[PDB]
Design a protein around this ligand. Sequence first.
Ligand code: G3H
Ligand code: ZN
Ligand code: ZN
Lengths: 337, 335
Amino acid sequence: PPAVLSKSGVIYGKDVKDLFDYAQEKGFAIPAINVTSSSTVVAALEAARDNKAPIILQTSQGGAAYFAGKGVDNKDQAASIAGSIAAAHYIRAIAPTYGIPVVLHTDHCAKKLLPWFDGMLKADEEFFAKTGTPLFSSHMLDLSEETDDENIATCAKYFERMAKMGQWLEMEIGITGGLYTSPETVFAVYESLHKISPNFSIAAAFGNVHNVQLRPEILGDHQVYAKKQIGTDAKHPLYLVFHGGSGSTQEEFNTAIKNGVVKVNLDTDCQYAYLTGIRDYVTNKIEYLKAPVGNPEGADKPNKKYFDPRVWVREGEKTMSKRIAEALDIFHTKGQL
Amino acid sequence: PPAVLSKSGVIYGKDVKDLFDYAQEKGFAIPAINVTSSSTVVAALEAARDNKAPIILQTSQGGAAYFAGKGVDNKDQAASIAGSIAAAHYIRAIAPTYGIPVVLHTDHCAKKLLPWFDGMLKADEEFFAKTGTPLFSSHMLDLSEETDDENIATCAKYFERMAKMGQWLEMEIGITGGLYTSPETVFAVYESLHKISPNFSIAAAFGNVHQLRPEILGDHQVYAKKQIGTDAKHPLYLVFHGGSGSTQEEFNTAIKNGVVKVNLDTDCQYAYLTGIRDYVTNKIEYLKAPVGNPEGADKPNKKYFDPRVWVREGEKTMSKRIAEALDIFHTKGQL
Ligand SMILES: O=C[C@H](O)COP(=O)(O)O
Ligand SMILES: [Zn+2]
Ligand SMILES: [Zn+2]
């Protein structure tokens, strides 16, 4: 067990790596939950603390923009940069309060959206200039719609800006430049990035879209390739990330983790869960009228105790946390702290 | 006009004062909203911007705790401290990009709740130690239930720790002694606090339990003029608590007498509910995950159940209601 398992709050640099290394070692993966509000942040932080598990909390470009407010325009990425950095502050401030270690990350960033990645890494650098630590734990680039050789050229240039602050980077690659992704194209990315820093993870195409069936076994192939191309004893010389894995079998997850996946993304199954408990507050339908709670007093009995947001929102957090709990069990992440 | 009405973000020290002076000068009160989540902060921060008016975002003891989480133990004020600091930072970071000047306040803190006020203050001064600004812009102390002597004294003791960081202090005073609140007892507050720093606000008891006699605020003002001899018809910064529900002309009489912030909570809580409750209308496309209307049970609810769509409805309704109230307070359009 490294330092991280006993840490509290968001984590950075080597610590991130330790965690992932640990993850591979004991054979669990860590859920990365998308968050859109302080409330949803809480929901997940609480789940992780209640289940003695570390957690990755990420914000997508939309998510980030929501942290900002849906009323700020995004014509130049302003909303996601503002939002993203405010979320990073809030997350940083509260995370320590739960007993666990947290990885603050950002989801899918394509070429089209590179401005956002600029803004965020702008802050990272100046935060590092003040604290000795970046704002976010990691960041992601999704340039899989471009060409493999371009794709890693943009990851490279970025990843050497990033390595100055020991930041982690995750990049996704698919079947385009020069079906599923070849053990070779994976090794190509590791070959061009590992020279810089070891703080990188890969999202490969393997029958998981975000006709084409899921083949987690391919991830094993990616490992046995680099293993041989480096001549290491290391079973898992790659840090692998599972996108769109929602609703798969338990043994699909198994083969993916045993094949060294350390991070599964959860997003829309949490969204539904969040709504689920707040929606069940349609059971206080007539109590959702301003001053008159029909049940006991027609129009002369106040219902501030029914419509206080800290009663019904909380009901939604509870059901979101519960579904995150299910996931911490499934990925063997529960009880590793 | 001073520097404040140009700036964007959260304000501190002298700039908080400048703001309040203008308030009483041009005859408007700035709405103090109680937020409980990034979401509600948005509603407030946006309705302010859209109406080209500044705003006060406040956090109550229970709302602060809600910003940390209802699952974090609060026996020791733990949850209210952490939540406050985290909300502080969030509002700090996001407020800029909304283009308004914002005062970062904490609501009613009673005697038994002083541990909370302690923790915030520690953080405050430790922030000041790194930035030459505190974390929070302003703070509140509700000690009304105590005897008025012990009220003013305890406000003093904290005020001076607080004045070292140019921080503002609001205090509540009632009918406890040591019926409405006397001009004298309010002046006693002034006489005791102006000795440390002029950065202090007063909520006084005038038939607003938590019927209305707003004219009494004036008496508090006339009186104090006498007792210091100054031209100024507004020697005091007064706060209107329990405002949700009074007539427009009550609010008007209250501004006359020099109130510069009107606390709003429960009408926003309902305003925020409204739009989300009105998603009792799409309940058949939000009861499953797949079962849509326009097809048996093989469709995508994802764009209906996404919280980004349905909490935005609520923030909108709350934003509207914040709008109404910043109009009636004649604060809409001072930028
Ligand atoms: O701080 C004072 C409270 O916010 C009063 O407002 P309310 O009348 O909305 O409860
Ligand atoms: Zn992807
Ligand atoms: Zn009060």
